[model samples]
Target: MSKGEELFTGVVPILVELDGDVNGHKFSVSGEGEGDATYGKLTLKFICTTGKLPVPWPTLVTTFLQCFARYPDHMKQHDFFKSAMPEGYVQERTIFFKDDGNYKTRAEVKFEGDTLVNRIELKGIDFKEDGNILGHKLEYNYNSHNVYIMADKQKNGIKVNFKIRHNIEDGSVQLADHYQQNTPIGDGPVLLPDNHYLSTQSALSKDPNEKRDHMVLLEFVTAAGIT
Candidate 1:
């Protein structure tokens, strides 16, 4: 319940709902004002470089992007990519910078059933004409309190909260320690009432016999949902 939080501090989880089951752990969903925070609001200024993703950097970062949902759950089904991005949204969000020489971050993400998939294709050169392509760095934040509480914390239950920050260091590893440092370090259960760290695997792992009950509690009570 603690190790997971340090893995990714950017992803926030919170309580959102509940019913008659309440006696132990209390997970109450607070108000995520406007729910607009779900959108990546952080600003990661990358300095382009003539280098090529610094070699191992691409592969490492790509792996991290793979199961983002299982960890934090960023850019929902229809939020990642759009032929025509909304006013505040970018059609193809770019994270690389224009420094070192050149570089580009082209991300393509979608939903497969309940799974969130992402593909990041990059391009560009020194970017000297534009700027230097240095390394990658993100400036992100989360608000578990701002989340919409579908339910309140109850006894004998858990509270769930969630927040998806655009680009922030939640510990783990970022650009081989080039830009910022890893943070939100902890260890324990995967999930938390406030999403101390965006991490949770299978509710069945908790109780096989009452797995179905766990699902129901998640959907109608905590942050987990069947939909």
Candidate 2:
């Protein structure tokens, strides 16, 4: 059932069509924490881990990437993109730097199905996957876990950024540090005290503080206007 697991087929299934179904079949409307669906915002992505058994296990491993948040309370407004954007939807773009690169962001956005939109271009800030209707600017804080996004680098680039601290409270997403790799080891890029992990590095942890805490990439989670 490819096409990335047949689009949206689980964890909140529903779409009983009476006209050409498009293969979309999965329904349920029962209740249990259903209406107010709750606040949305939870994205965790960070990668480093790959094929092993070759020179320091591909440079030691690493992983952490996640998603969860279900927007729908008026689009969970901080400005709601500032105005409107509801055409052929696909949103989920989140960036936060300061490993000294000094960055900050929040575009499109998603909590679980996925999050944000921006096939990415950072180093001066970009975030694009087609645009317009990014109405309000940007500002997201999610309360605490070392997250703060305000965006203003002359209009969203390098003004100030955060989320690379380490505390972690468990929403599901872990792995906190000790990943090294230069990839050469023959007389060029060999600076290995070694570490690695990157090929499907979804969610893992052993607590190097949570594997360096700061990498959240959740592509989608649109339960949109929960019933």
Candidate 3:
């Protein structure tokens, strides 16, 4: 298998390693419920859908971009860059901003292998409208050598001076207003217009409000933690 092929487990590590032996194989199972930070403040990510057709398909990407622009900001206290950075891990130098309205997250995270992407989802955050952790987009590049978190950014360049929360111990990562629950529950990113399950978004509905409540979702690719 490829280098990042084993990142399917844990909270989506950028790149991970697999020893080929069952004993040395990395954990590829995602946490069932809200992952407990008792072990550590986990970095949550998902593999966004590429849309069946067309670049930037209106499926989930469009909705997430809209929410990312209107969402409130918070301070992720437990983030590795913010709190748990290891020795010699210069917070200011290692961290960076990708850009504004997205494409502004500049983390230099390196996957263990040659940097293959593993797709993922936020718990079960699908096309639901009413949920937490919605309305945000995250993309990054992992530098396997230095192990930096590199977030992709927009016109403003990369966003290095960013944190997800002052503390995720009691809540999930901050998302769009359509999201942002004070609990550890995360609302996935809604990147598409038709981003909802059949029940959440339907032609019979009058608007977003008329739909039933569901969770938002985030999809990403990560290797199991190689660190």
Candidate 4:
């Protein structure tokens, strides 16, 4: 059995929920972790069910990399988009395993052309820490860059930063007071508002037919799976 399964044999999975709108489209991101203090595994997913346009894959991929930068060696081990992106249909799934630390990772993607039609599932990501697990805490820190094309054909961007402290034993999660800070980098795109916990920007498309808008929201909770 994997170390994660062994350590968390009797423990229920702790779930983290992130619900919001991406580029004006409603989306939900969920996270689940299992294992003990020294070793564990986590699964993170992003899904959007309501929207005329699909979720942007580039932004979501960037977000995934940023959130789990330290693990999987920045996702350099494998090229997520190895094959030529198929037209009208884009689906990929990969699984990795290492006997060294019993590390296992599974990454899946489902997109309709340039946008995400279904969801992105990143599962069974094994994590090894020094003594953080022993302390009954899981600390996470990352900054994400969200880019989207506006109706004006101008590319706009937002920065969503995070600092999370999750208590393993007590099932409590804490966020920094300034969790979603708006730090504009360079002078390329216009920096939008960063008030929501998950999104650092917002926009409304002038083209009514496009029906495009951008926003993000998130919520954290410790529960069984992503109910």
Candidate 5:
């Protein structure tokens, strides 16, 4: 078996923990994995929050990208860098994004070892229309029907990408209006578009509403397993 296969076969207990600060908010990304040759499962958790509630969408995006840049290093730690594995090795995977307080979102994908089946859940967020906050909470589920899994040619890590289009047609309008009213435009380099409030078009723009495509890179280099 290749080294990558050995690692996937559960040869070592692997956990990746990455954290940073964005816009004075504390953000963390963590995951743990366990599996064998036939079946393997991985759960990844992302927390980005100020003390009270979710940070602004732009801030969340910045935090996520900062964490992403550390992927190559994360992979090297497990000695899985440049390692190769069989296609469709990941049978199942789940991801969670939380404010670590009240709000959270979830995405689950089942490859069934080859094909794709997926679902996304959005929760704990408020809805607004006609300039009024709705009494109802925004709790909904939908299939993006756009899920992809591929190997990173450069880093040799696994990449899971999925989009969660909102069910509400005017969702982006509400969000952009809220952002404009609350945040001063041109305060930063990011520009919010009408089609998707969190979608960005320039450098330093962090669009949290867009599809999430994160690389799963393992870590743990020293024989002593020092982090």
Candidate 6:
């Protein structure tokens, strides 16, 4: 039997209602919350540049660098071309940023049919400067739920927490989370908006009909549904 916990007084961050089961056992209706942090309160977003995506990091970063150098001015800011975009693509939604190594991460993920029930926790976490970069440099983790982005320090090493989630079969990707306080170095932004999220997501459009970035007003609980 699974250990149980009850909800008390607080606002619901994600009110998810399942259609089939929990942990594949078969059920519906469950709620989730992240006590104090504002991490998951606002999800992350992104876009693809080329037809082939998640395009090896080396290739992905290289293209982004090139685009930043040549693309229009707005590309520098964060905006998407709603009408003018490739085909066979969708936006990504970030669920959360994994804890820095300072804390032990306990993530219990299960596949129930096409739905994914993923829970993560940071044990004894103590926030520190450049922790996100520290975590990515240390782990080789990747999945539909999260991604690993290297902090290329050659250019004044900016501290940002961003990732992408995608559904390959449907050619859809979700660009989640990008946090940076100060103005970034050359080709970097002081702040990123939804369009910046969309352009990045559109960078990897496998088809010409791929749509541009969009705000996820109401996200589905399941992986596919969210995409």
List TM-score per model, in order: 0.23, 0.24, 0.16, 0.21, 0.29, 0.18
- Predicted model with the maximum TM-score: 5
Residue range 1-227, candidate 1, lDDT tens digits: 23222222343322112111111212211111111123222111111122222322221221122112332243122111121111111112223331233223333333333223333344444333221112233322221212221211232112223322223244422221111111111221112123222232211112345312121111101222323
lDDT of 6 at 42: 18
lDDT of 4 by residue, 1-227 (tens): 11111222232233333343322334455433331211122233333334432332222322231111111222222111111112111222222212111111122322233222223433222323322221224323223322221111232222233332222334544222111112112233322322222222212113234233322222221111111
lDDT of 5 by residue, 1-227 (tens): 23333334333232334343322334444433332222222222233222322233322221121111112232333322113221212112222222112233333322234222222222333322222123222222222122233334343243433333222334531121111111111112211111111111111222366244232322111111123
Give one digit per residue, the lDDT tens place, for model 3 in 134-154.
222222111111111223222
lDDT of every predicted structure (CA atoms)? 0.23, 0.21, 0.19, 0.26, 0.26, 0.23
TM-score of 4: 0.21
Scanning candidate 5 in windows of ten residues, the lowest lDDT window is 176-185
Q: Rank the candidates by TM-score, best first.
A: 5, 2, 1, 4, 6, 3
Ranking by lDDT: 5, 4, 6, 1, 2, 3
Summarize candidate 2's per-residue lDDT along 114-182 as a digit string, tens digits. 322222111213322221101111122121222222323232211212232321233322222221111
Question: Relative to the unseen true structure, what is the C-alpha lDDT of residue 170 in candidate 2, on a scale of 0 to 100?
Answer: 33
At residue 12, candidate 1 shows an lDDT of: 30
lDDT preference between candidates 2 and 4, better one: 4
Instruction: Please state every model's RMSD to the true fold in angstroms.
Output: 20.9, 20.6, 20.3, 21.2, 17.7, 21.6
> What TM-score does prediction 6 earn?
0.18
Clashes of 3: 63
